[PDB]
Design a protein around this ligand. Structure first.
Ligand SMILES: [Zn+2]
Lengths: 193, 56, 50, 115, 102, 123
RNA sequence: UGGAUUCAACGCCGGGAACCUCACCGGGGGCGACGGCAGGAUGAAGGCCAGGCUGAAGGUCUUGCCGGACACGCCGAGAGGA
RNA sequence: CCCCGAAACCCCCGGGCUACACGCGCGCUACAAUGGGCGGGACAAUGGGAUCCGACCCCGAAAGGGGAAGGGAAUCCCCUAAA
């Protein structure tokens, strides 16, 4: 085992975990995870927005989940615990998924998008952009961007600061792509106070 | 119905059938440079999550 | 399903087996007959009368 | 009158496989020295029986990679070309060749005009 | 006295520096002789994919890169020093390896 | 090994099925044979003391010699109606025609007390 | 086998295909989850000894074989579909 | 969405995608002396390595073969490049 091999392996494993949980906890605002291999075992921490949903009925869910974890993925001794997002309204994949969940409930896209935008910009984001792309308003597909505030697109500050999120809304007639981008209250180079 | 089942998942050891992406399951353009086994498409999709960056 | 295979013949107070036996195998193994040889039902391997 | 490498066919038969291989070219020698596949061995024993016995049948096969041997002589083998079992009556001067060389897959082209 | 090599590798210079500062400050808390954080050549795993699935259009490439920074530290092997460098936090995105030269 | 015409005596639905529910927790303690080949095997070897048979098997295979043979060992055979409750009481999913009891469990105090009930009825 | 046909198709689909890859061709063999239907395990759902067919095959079969056990022979309704 | 659905699903053998009277694109080698051959002499970097790189020794005309130090990578090797 070479060292780059180790890094690659850890990343790939974690990525596949992330994929599985993204599938299975999409009702829970699954934002992500983190993993530490303590001596007594490997303890992981799921950051999500409804730990109630990830635990289910008295730990049922975490139990079958940790079984899956140690079995399908090489893990010494899973020690799942759960935590929240400190500001999910600044997280953007949770919001993309909430929006897709809404569109699947059946809410109209303008209403859902503007609701989410209002929520984010009241919860304190400097900027927000939302693209909905697909068979909106009939059979020929189109794209709609709902935006508010101040948002950068290009450069390292975009690649770092703004949080990007993507989701599919699987409706009766097809997919709606939901891109969300949120710029929090943090500063850029040309400020110069 | 006394017979013998003949699906015969044959264990290739070299070949485009031997190697398969761990995500989608594609057989051809698979990355195996440093222990990876990923289709070029998937890799491009997830490389940031693995820590790969695009400074050039 | 062949579905009826009563082979033993009751001699009266005891059964006698229609089966033959394989010597290189264990007990209970019952055999067939194909014109010069036997057949193992448990696993199946080479054998002849001789 | 035939004389493969200064050896007549009787001698080729009485030879073993090792020495015949020594007489063969490098490719076929390698094939043998690496050994035959199960399908090849089954074909071969069919052929043994047919020189003996009768085998009660013509010899058919999918194996185009079996190198011909002196034992595979005076016999007609039907080789699969992809579509058909085409017959190959084996003479002495096929002695170190593959069956596929005589069973062909693509028929000759007789072109039409461009368009 | 026999020496102890500590090869440590990461993707974050700052975690790496944190560890090396832990080691520096602990050796000078004690008095054992450090051998500096020798910086080794950093590995650039480069993967040059084509960024198109279609195969159509102009050919454009993504040159993705992973960087592994590597340091080594030699410190004389004492039971005290060894116990406490074992006690070190060693954050998650770092590997270490304590070989001993004897 | 029974037929619809080959029902000689009276079996209470409580007796037969509850004795089988008793040896249900006996098959985990030991071997219990099934089918008429193994039932002939058991009854003619002599290891069994009684059997329980159903009216399902096709065609007549032993009833030509069983009436003069059943008294060879003083061995009773209790009737169960059919495949359905036979296989449902046997614990398995797919039934048999005969339940040849070897090594009974849950105590002779109940098993062969019901054998005393067929001492009442017949052998 | 296909896709792509000015720029922006044609050493492109990371497409350097012996098998696989493959999607084409010739041949061969497996697959109905859930229910119900024909039934039922009676010794078999399933595997299976020597051979005939077979390119080769317990695939099949006269001839026989048992380790202990349900159902495409029929419907819906499906899994999967490069 | 439509269709196949016991076949348009899955697996195996063999063939094919490698066929060639022709047209086109991109390229390699050349049409020589601003060179060809032979023998000698020099000078790199990037990257990669576990059933993987393989120095070093021996065998062989070559391709290659046997054994094999060290090397999980600023330690060893690929690796004394060609013009
Ligand atoms: Zn993939």
């Amino acid at each position: 085992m070479a060292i780059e091999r180790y890094f690659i392996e850890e990343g790939v494993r974690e990525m596949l975990i992330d994929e599985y949980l993204e599938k299975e906890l999409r009702r829970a605002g699954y934002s992500g995870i983190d993993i530490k291999k303590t001596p007594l075992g490997t303890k992981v921490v799921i950051f999500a927005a409804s730990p109630g949903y990830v635990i289910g009925r008295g730990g049922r869910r975490i139990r079958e989940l940790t079984r899956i974890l140690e079995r399908q993925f090489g893990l010494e001794n899973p020690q799942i615990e759960v935590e929240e997002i400190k500001n999910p309204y600044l997280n953007a994949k949770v919001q993309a998924i909430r929006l897709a969940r809404a569109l699947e409930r059946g809410i109209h896209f303008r209403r859902a998008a503007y609701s989410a935008i209002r929520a984010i910009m009241r919860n304190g984001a400097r900027g927000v952009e939302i693209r909905l792309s697909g068979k909106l308003t009939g059979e020929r597909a189109k794209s709609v961007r709902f935006y508010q505030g101040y948002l950068a697109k290009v450069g390292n500050p975009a690649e770092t600061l703004v949080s990007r999120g993507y989701a599919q809304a699987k409706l009766k007639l097809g997919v709606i792509g939901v891109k969300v981008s949120i710029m929090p209250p943090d500063a850029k180079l040309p400020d110069e106070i | 119905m006394a017979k013998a089942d003949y699906n015969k998942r044959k264990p290739r050891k070299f070949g485009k059938g031997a190697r398969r992406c761990v995500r989608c399951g594609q057989y051809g353009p698979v990355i195996r440079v440093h222990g990876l086994m990923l289709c070029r498409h998937c890799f491009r999709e997830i490389a940031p999550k693995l820590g790969f960056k695009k400074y050039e | 399903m062949g579905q009826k295979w009563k082979l033993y013949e009751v001699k009266g107070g005891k059964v006698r087996r229609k089966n033959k036996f394989c010597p290189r195998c264990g007990p209970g193994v019952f055999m067939a007959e194909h014109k010069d040889r036997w057949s193992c039902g448990r696993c199946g391997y080479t054998e002849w009368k001789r | 009158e035939f004389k493969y490498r200064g050896y007549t066919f009787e001698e080729l038969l009485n030879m073993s496989l090792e020495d015949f291989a020594k007489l063969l070219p490098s490719r076929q020698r390698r094939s043998l020295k690496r050994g035959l596949s199960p399908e090849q061995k089954k074909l071969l024993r069919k052929i043994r029986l047919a020189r003996k016995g009768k085998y009660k049948k013509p010899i058919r096969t999918h194996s185009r990679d079996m190198v011909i041997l002196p034992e595979m002589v005076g016999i007609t083998i039907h080789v699969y070309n992809g579509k058909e079992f085409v017959p190959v009556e084996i003479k002495e001067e096929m002695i170190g060749h593959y069956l596929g060389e005589f069973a062909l897959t693509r028929k000759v082209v007789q072109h039409g005009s461009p368009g | 006295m026999q020496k102890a090599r500590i090869k440590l590798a990461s993707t974050d210079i700052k975690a790496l520096n944190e560890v090396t500062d832990q080691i520096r400050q602990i050796a000078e808390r004690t008095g054992v002789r450090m051998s500096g954080p020798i910086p080794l050549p950093t590995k650039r795993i480069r993967i040059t994919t084509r960024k198109s699935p279609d195969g159509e259009g102009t050919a454009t490439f993504d040159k993705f890169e992973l960087r592994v920074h590597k340091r080594l530290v030699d410190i004389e092997a004492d039971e005290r020093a060894m116990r406490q460098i074992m006690r070190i936090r060693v954050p998650e995105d770092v590997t270490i390896e304590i070989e001993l030269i004897s | 090994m029974a037929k619809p015409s080959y029902v000689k005596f009276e079996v209470p639905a409580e007796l037969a099925e509850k004795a089988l529910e008793a040896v249900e927790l006996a098959r985990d303690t030991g071997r219990i044979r099934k089918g008429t080949n193994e039932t002939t095997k058991a009854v003619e070897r002599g290891q069994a003391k009684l059997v329980v048979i159903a009216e399902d098997v096709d065609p007549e295979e032993i009833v030509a010699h069983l009436p003069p043979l059943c008294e060879e060992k003083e061995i009773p055979y209790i009737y169960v109606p059919s495949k359905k409750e036979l296989g449902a009481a046997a614990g398995i999913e797919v039934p048999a025609a005969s339940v040849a009891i070897l090594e009974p469990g849950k105590g002779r105090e109940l098993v062969e007390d019901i054998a005393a009930k067929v001492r009442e009825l017949m052998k």
